[PDB]
Design a protein around this ligand. Structure first.
Ligand SMILES: Nc1ncnc2c1ncn2[C@@H]1O[C@H](COP(=O)(O)OP(=O)(O)NP(=O)(O)O)[C@@H](O)[C@H]1O
Ligand SMILES: Nc1ncnc2c1ncn2[C@@H]1O[C@H](COP(=O)(O)OP(=O)(O)NP(=O)(O)O)[C@@H](O)[C@H]1O
Ligand SMILES: O=C(C[C@H]1NCCC[C@@H]1O)Cn1cnc2cc(Br)c(Cl)cc2c1=O
Ligand SMILES: O=C(C[C@H]1NCCC[C@@H]1O)Cn1cnc2cc(Br)c(Cl)cc2c1=O
Ligand SMILES: [Mg+2]
Ligand SMILES: [Mg+2]
Ligand SMILES: [Mg+2]
Lengths: 480, 478
């Protein structure tokens, strides 16, 4: 059982919740964690979702090596270097993958010759390693992390930009539709974008309990900057040699940590049904040998019934644990529905179903279970999302002047503020908010994104900070 | 177009075929290779197949770190890759890249397992492994980075652990024989060949005729209790007494793709079994001038074939002749080509050519889906039955040591009665190597097959002249 309160010590709550639901096991190399089966199931669900979707776009999977040679790689303090095999030193040291541009792009130069070879659309599911300097957090910031990375190459900027946006929408679907986590689509500012690219888009999420925005995934319009460094050129139809226009995009096991932080409570995890490996757990109530044979047969019948409706059902008929130990176990683990079947319920042809998010109980006849559970699972899923969306919305404050900022940050909120979008000002702003945060004693404020969904901008509106005329509403806050 | 001949210059043939088919790209770090979509899709198929099967046995997936600290790993040496720095800074202890995950998984098992009610514990992971192999790299078969799965289970008893060893072994036979159409032989490794951290090692063995080598295809270990003793993986039984767990581990790699390539390939290139082919049917319109008539019909046909779950591509590229296209998709191993030209449009038909034998069929549009489903099953079956006959012809049953070198010189394996004395295997290895030079060349045990031929009473070991135990399969190896 979980005992730290989510709203008191958030850190300790998260650690307890992920350990006691058997999602992660700690490890001796710092910043690395073991992903146990209960967490791995959720990743498997989002993986299959995303993978299926990108295949409909013609993206194909591949696997490129985990090693890149020193001279091809040449961010530096993060790179893990292999220097030896056994007691022997490598003639030239080798780096483990931190990203795969330097591994993929020279091959792309070789394979692309003509318009007939475009678009080239590849992905890979793999792990990367970055010797993170920041405080590690299981899922959210780890030194080895699982991800996919998508890398595409096209004839025109328009087609590449369209795929950038399609992928971004798929990531809104991974968070929103699978994980029931609300995200904001935006553009990264010039200071925050991937420097090898032209434009970076993001989906951004929010952790209410510590006030932090967090980048949930990313999708880059790379332009022709990398085609030029790597000599990725093709002949069009009229015999002419052109640079490719490229995209890349990635999303990681960070997504699980965001889910856990978003929906969990004081009793531990709450898993949204769309990604729960066990949607419904059936618990026989077995005590002083009362009806034990008939309770178990009904449990099996109920399961076959529910899986005809494609519900994911487990019977926990394990002998060596009490029914109450099972209630608690599958609560902490975040199973959406718990169906209890004891002697009394057996006599009435009913079952008692407890939903995990609100703790509400229902009495339901065997004949209405399938359609009633499906309805409840759709209500849990929608309800998790809507409550998280309202919290997201409660957490962002529309403002006009710099004077409003530090108070908004102290309330653990984000700010939506009009901004001139000048690179020099973000640097000034972050150095400044850091100063005032140190003095007040918890971190600098930065841009998260410029949201796609722009509210109206009145003609004389000025930038909240410089005073120059503003261009767009930009979302700022503290961040992971 | 492939030009090295598969029987005559096998090594060149293999390199050409995997490169020209667009399966692999060569890379500047030795023994590492890019797996392009054409190959990777086959990996995805076998992965999905094996993963669904082990999920039915209650095995669950997990991801353990790729890094293991020196003190945990050294609880082989020359193969370990060591990370000593991050950026310009030295780590306090050097970290190994996971050559295999025993030393990463078993301390966690020792934490998680306390009572009989925690058992069985059954995990698998899909990951890559790194070993700095001393032997010559070969794409797929022996690489310095490879993809695999590793399964590791723990049981209250030896008998349940063994049951699982054999079930996993059966799944490996299905990975090879049902998905890749590659015949394999189940058997027990000898004492010198088994995994030394285990009690008994079971295997599926395969055979490459063109160089006469056996190759271990996959492996499944009854580990017994020795790791449980080493890592202190113990549980209280039902009476409160502490007991050691009984463990298994098993694994299979991208080696399997290379075996499939070599098994079914011919002088024109790859031949991919339909169950795993990325494209099962390529539609090649006879075009040189486009008007929409041919291409329109080819789209309608693709839609109809996809309804029947056929993986179809239309090669509508403008600048290639149909002949160039036939060759291209033949080198890639597409099992069925569907040709659609003006004459075909005029007669409501399509001409389908099989990659494995070259036979052509004329088929009405209406009959396409069922006839192609039938062909695919004919191709998959015929690829297997042919490879199985070649495997059979590659093994000579013998009685005496004098029949050995001639059988090895015929690029054949030997099946021989053996006393199974461990000293004798070391001797046979040395004496066959030394005769290979004065004429690696060593002949070693591949396995002791579950399928034993008859052993008449009094049959003698082919090497020691002592009483023979079982027939053992021997040859040159990867
Ligand atoms: N250490 C990490 N652990 C887990 N997820 C990560 C980690 N670093 C990045 N991610 C996620 O992976 C996505 C793509 O990686 P990338 O764009 O390289 O991130 P980044 O530039 O390193 N962001 P940041 O580390 O905050 O500077 C990010 O948008 C994050 O959602
Ligand atoms: N370098 C490699 N590349 C690809 N597959 C491999 C490689 N080494 C082993 N395998 C395969 O993985 C299976 C399990 O690995 P493992 O049991 O560790 O083999 P091993 O003991 O290293 N065999 P070997 O190295 O030939 O003596 C082996 O039976 C092979 O089928
Ligand atoms: O990794 C990226 C840019 C994109 N690469 C493809 C997947 C999606 C991803 O956003 C940014 N990035 C982040 N961290 C890095 C760390 C190191 Br070390 C290196 Cl060499 C390079 C990088 C690096 O390029
Ligand atoms: O890797 C194995 C034993 C088993 N591990 C799980 C998958 C199936 C496999 O047969 C044998 N082996 C092979 N090569 C190794 C190389 C090194 Br380096 C190390 Cl440390 C250890 C090993 C090592 O243990
Ligand atoms: Mg970073
Ligand atoms: Mg950043
Ligand atoms: Mg060996």
């Amino acid at each position: 059982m979980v005992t730290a309160k989510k709203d008191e010590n958030f850190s300790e709550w998260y650690t307890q919740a992920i350990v006691r639901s058997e999602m992660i096991e700690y490890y001796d190399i710092s910043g690395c964690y073991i992903m146990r089966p209960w967490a791995f199931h959720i990743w498997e669900k989002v993986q299959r979702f995303f993978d299926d979707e990108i295949k409909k776009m013609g993206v194909e999977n591949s696997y490129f090596p985990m090693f890149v040679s020193r001279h091809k790689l040449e961010f530096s303090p993060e790179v893990a270097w292999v220097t030896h095999y056994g007691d022997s030193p490598l003639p030239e040291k080798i780096a483990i993958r931190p990203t795969s541009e330097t591994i993929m792009y020279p091959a792309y130069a070789k394979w692309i010759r003509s318009h007939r070879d475009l678009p080239l659309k590849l992905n890979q599911w793999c792990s990367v390693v970055r010797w993170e300097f920041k405080q590690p957090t299981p899922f959210l910031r780890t030194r080895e992390f699982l991800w996919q990375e998508g890398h595409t190459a096209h004839a025109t900027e328009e087609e590449a930009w369209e795929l950038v946006l399609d992928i971004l929408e798929l990531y809104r679907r991974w968070y929103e539709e699978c994980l029931a986590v609300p995200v904001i689509k935006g553009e990264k500012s010039e200071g925050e974008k991937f420097a090898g690219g032209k434009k970076t888009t993001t989906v951004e999420a929010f952790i209410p309990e510590n006030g932090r925005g967090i980048q949930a995934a990313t999708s880059h319009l790379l332009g022709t900057n990398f085609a030029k460094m790597f000599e990725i050129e093709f002949e069009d139809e009229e015999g002419h040699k052109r640079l490719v226009h490229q995209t890349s995009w990635g999303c990681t096991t960070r997504s699980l940590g965001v889910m856990i932080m978003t929906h969990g409570d004081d009793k531990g995890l709450v898993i949204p049904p769309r990604v729960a490996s066990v949607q419904v757990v059936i618990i026989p109530i077995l005590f002083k040998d009362e009806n034990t044979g008939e309770i178990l047969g009904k449990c099996r019948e109920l399961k076959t019934m529910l899986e005809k409706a494609d519900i994911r059902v487990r019977i926990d008929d394990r002998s060596n644990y009490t029914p109450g130990w099972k209630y608690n176990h599958w609560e902490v683990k975040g199973v959406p529905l718990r169906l209890e079947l004891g002697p009394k319920d057996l006599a009435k042809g009913t079952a008692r179903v407890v939903r995990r998010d609100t703790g509400e109980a229902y009495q339901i006849s065997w004949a209405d279970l399938a359609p009633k559970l499906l309805e409840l699972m759709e209500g849990i899923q929608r309800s998790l999302f809507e409550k998280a969306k309202a919290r997201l919305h409660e957490g962002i404050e529309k403002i006009s002047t710099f004077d409003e900022v530090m108070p908004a940050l102290n309330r653990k909120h984000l700010v939506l503020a009009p901004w001139c979008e000048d690179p020099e000002s973000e640097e000034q702003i972050k150095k400044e908010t850091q100063k005032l945060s140190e003095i007040q004693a918890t971190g600098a404020m930065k841009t998260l994104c410029i949201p796609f969904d722009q509210p109206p901008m009145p003609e004389g509106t000025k930038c909240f900070y410089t005073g120059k005329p503003a261009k767009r509403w930009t979302l700022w806050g503290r961040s992971y």
